[model samples]
Target: NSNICEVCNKWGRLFCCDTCPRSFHEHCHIPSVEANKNPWSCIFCRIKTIQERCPESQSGHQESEVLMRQMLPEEQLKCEFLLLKVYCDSKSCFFASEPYYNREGSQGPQKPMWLNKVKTSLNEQMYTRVEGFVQDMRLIFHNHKEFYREDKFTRLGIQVQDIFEKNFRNIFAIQETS
Candidate 1:
């Protein structure tokens, strides 16, 4: 084009086009396009830029939380269900294996009495505890698994590595509960 703007190298900002977004600087407008062209704004001033600014979306954070909880919900839940059930057993409650009585020496009333014994009182505080634990677990992974630029990775690698080391120790460390 005969009329070239310096910044964008197009036909706008007569003297000072930013040359970045290919937008003509305000003063570069020629008589025809210049009179018609209103004061133009740069890409940085636009609102749509905000969406592209962040490396991760909000939904990504939520997904990370759920995945981490699935991986390691609690220290106790790390084991099999049968093992946990065994530990909850009590002699008076007959929480273990059961005996079966028969009719006329034949296998008849062999049902374990432990069926549906949960008809007793429920622990009210457990609801809050369970929900709170879920939220806490979600927060743990969601907050920890951050997505950022390469520079941010360089800055946080030290602390992030420390967290991994701590988790490794926690996994190997023996506890009285076990």
Candidate 2:
């Protein structure tokens, strides 16, 4: 065997073949099998918050004024159903879990993001604007891309975002109900 082994980037047991996905790491870490190598935590915030304005949470509506305004009450429900679509369609709830990366312990400003938190937030009625909802769902997809380092995780996130965007439009696409 002509294969040589050595420590790289101050770490042991990780090999890269000219930027290949075969690089030792999880699915999220392997963005590709060829071209462009390199790159790429969880935490319970102990639970606490402010401003409470919700009841049962499974039913409500306040659709008016679109995405630019503070997520309307009716439109707010869109997030709930849309989120359900995201979770219900997946084979497993991988996106819905609160995995901690603290992210690979590298020490960067990778704030923890997850599906549940967004849903939790959606229910809070505190979305200053519809974009907050947009950012949360979008971030889940983006976060997956960053954390997975171009691996299967990234791919999964991509599709999830596709579905999210597709459904979001319908859910919030206000129309004349007169």
Candidate 3:
């Protein structure tokens, strides 16, 4: 644990390997792991595991991409759906109900019809086709106060949210309509 970091010689928050004497700065670790996860090995150990699993001639990046593409269609769709969920969570979508909808005076539909359109687009694998629709949905949210006075806080909006959440559970095995 007293060994100098391979990337930086300075003392700081370091990732100490359980299998090896090499200690690395958290920033300096080439490929990082979750810090809170216990009984974790360093990059060196992980690289060995990867080498055993992948061919010796294959580069790490190439092999990983190949591995991702090799997943079954259902698994691939699930992965993509989860990734989209994360992307949607990061944005100011109807799912996130803060900074705009949390106030007493602030009000809108708990769910918007636009999310169903997004789910339908994802199910159809029409990312290119859906991009425009998503942009329009964002614009609706952008001028929501002026646009959705009546429908925003109605049962239809709540139903949209409910249906969207239900769709998340059924996103597996979705195929491209195209």
- Predictions ranked by lDDT, top down? 2, 3, 1
Q: In model 1, where do residues sit more than 4 Å from their true spots?
A: 1-147, 153-158, 161-165, 168-178
Against the true structure, whose TM-score is highest?
2
Better of 1 and 2 by TM-score: 2
Candidate 1's TM-score reads 0.16
Candidate 2 lDDT by residue in tens digits, 1-178? 1132211112334444442222322211211122343432100000001112433332333443455766655556555556655654553266777865655633422666677777667656657787777777787777677777745656887888888866665555434244
**lDDT scores of the candidates, listed in order:** 0.29, 0.52, 0.45
Alpha carbon RMSD to native, model 1: 27.0
Report the lDDT tens digits of candidate 1 across residue range 1-178: 2255422355644432232343334432211123432454332222123334642322222323333443232312321111222222222122223334333423422223221121110112222222333343223223322322233432333443344334323332323231
Candidate 1 at 126: error in angstroms?
10
lDDT of 3 by residue, 110-136 (tens): 444344454455446555432333343
Q: Which sections of candidate 2 miss by over 4 Å?
A: 1-65, 102-109, 174-178
lDDT of 1 at 7: 29
RMSD of 3: 14.6
**Of the candidates shown, which would achieve the greatest lDDT relative to the real structure?**
2
